[PDB]
């Protein structure tokens, strides 16, 4: 390589992004959501049509942020090896923060469980609450989630191997096996005897599993954008960072479910 040619390229492996309007558009969408939600809670508007609008703009702006990331990684190709390590490291530091949010929810459960309050019964769960039975329906969700970790594993290695019919089929089963988890969890919520308003027991129960429930819906969306990118020849055999972070996300989210299955279901009845 000539000295003249090398000077027509970056001298460092890090990616310099052009100025973008999305960091502030999302910032303005977060104020409208924060300012409209604070009003509808006490009136001052009349109906919940502005909250829906704020959520739609918040989601749509975030889609256009991710729309730019895939363009500069697949068409402009600015993700060198050094850049790819930072993205993986940044996601690993992001899932640790996600775990510690759950760690604050387990602390809230153990506080009222080990020494149950006196306004409740002397026992736990409180008197007159029909808790979810661990063996009938939640056990179906446990087997489903474990099988998701087994079918995304050979979908990952089939992509490395080089055949696309097994890689594409592994995700398709993975997506529909996660949707079944969401629909089955939907069935239990609408058939439960107790509500979020049922004292302290309903608060901790629906905050742990509800936060996981909201995380599973975001997992299916992440799985859905990997099926579009694989079908349209975006993900290559040796460069898929949007797929590696999805496999770590589903494996970490199975460990959290197993912990939520031992203390909220078994140990709490």
């Amino acid at each position: 390589m000539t000295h003249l040619e090398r000077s027509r390229h970056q001298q460092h492996p890090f990616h310099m992004v052009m100025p973008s309007p999305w960091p502030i558009v999302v910032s303005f969408a977060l104020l409208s959501l924060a300012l409209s939600t604070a009003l509808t809670m006490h009136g001052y508007i009349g109906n919940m049509n502005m909250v829906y609008l704020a959520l739609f703009v918040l989601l749509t702006s975030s889609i256009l942020w991710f729309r730019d990331i895939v363009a500069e990684a697949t068409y402009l190709g600015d993700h060198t090896m050094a850049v790819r390590k930072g993205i993986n490291l940044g996601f690993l530091m992001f899932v640790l923060s996600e775990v510690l949010i759950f760690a604050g929810l387990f602390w809230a459960y153990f506080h009222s469980a080990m020494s149950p309050d006196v306004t409740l019964g002397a026992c736990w769960p409180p008197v007159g609450i029909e808790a979810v039975q661990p063996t009938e329906l939640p056990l179906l969700n446990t087997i489903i989630l474990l099988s998701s970790g087994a079918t995304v594993t050979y979908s990952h290695h089939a992509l490395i191997a080089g055949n696309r019919n097994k890689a594409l089929s592994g995700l398709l089963i993975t997506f529909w096996l996660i949707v079944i988890f969401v629909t089955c969890q939907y069935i239990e919520y609408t058939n439960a005897a107790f509500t979020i308003s049922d004292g302290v027991y309903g608060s901790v129960f629906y905050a742990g599993t509800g936060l996981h429930f909201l995380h599973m819906v975001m997992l299916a969306a992440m799985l859905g954008v990997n099926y579009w990118r694989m079908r349209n020849y975006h993900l290559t055999a040796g460069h898929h960072v949007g797929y590696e972070t999805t496999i770590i996300y589903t494996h970490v989210l199975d460990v959290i479910w197993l912990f939520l299955y031992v203390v909220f279901y078994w140990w709490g009845v």
């Binding site: 329906l137 290695h157 089939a158």
Partner: protein, 110 residues
């Protein structure tokens, strides 16, 4: 002008063989996980889905039996049961996001 020095030629053939070694390890280990999926995961789901299907229908007939007779009225609520410190803003005053009028009632004993 050469910029970089002479090619190593030793990092090559150690980088170009690890790629072949990596895809070979993913080739057979993928076949191992397919065997686990079909012979462990699939039977496990089939033996727990048929069980859940039968128990679910047993619950379903119980739920529709509740509507048939109010009879002796719904069980009374403890002091912590229904909390109405501030009414919900979405619709009527007292209904949660997921409400099943069959099993959730909130009758007021005044």
């Amino acid at each position: 002008k050469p910029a970089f020095g002479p090619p190593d030629k030793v990092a090559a053939q150690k980088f170009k063989e690890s790629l072949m070694a990596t895809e070979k390890h993913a080739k057979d280990t993928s076949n191992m996980w397919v065997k686990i999926s079909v012979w462990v995961a699939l039977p496990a789901i089939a033996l727990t889905a048929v069980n859940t299907y039968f128990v679910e229908k047993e619950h379903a007939e119980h739920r529709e039996h509740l509507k048939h007779v109010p009879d002796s009225e719904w069980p009374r609520d403890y002091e912590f049961m229904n909390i109405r410190s501030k009414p919900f803003f979405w619709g009527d005053g007292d209904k949660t996001l997921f409400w099943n009028p069959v099993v959730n009632r909130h009758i007021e004993h005044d």
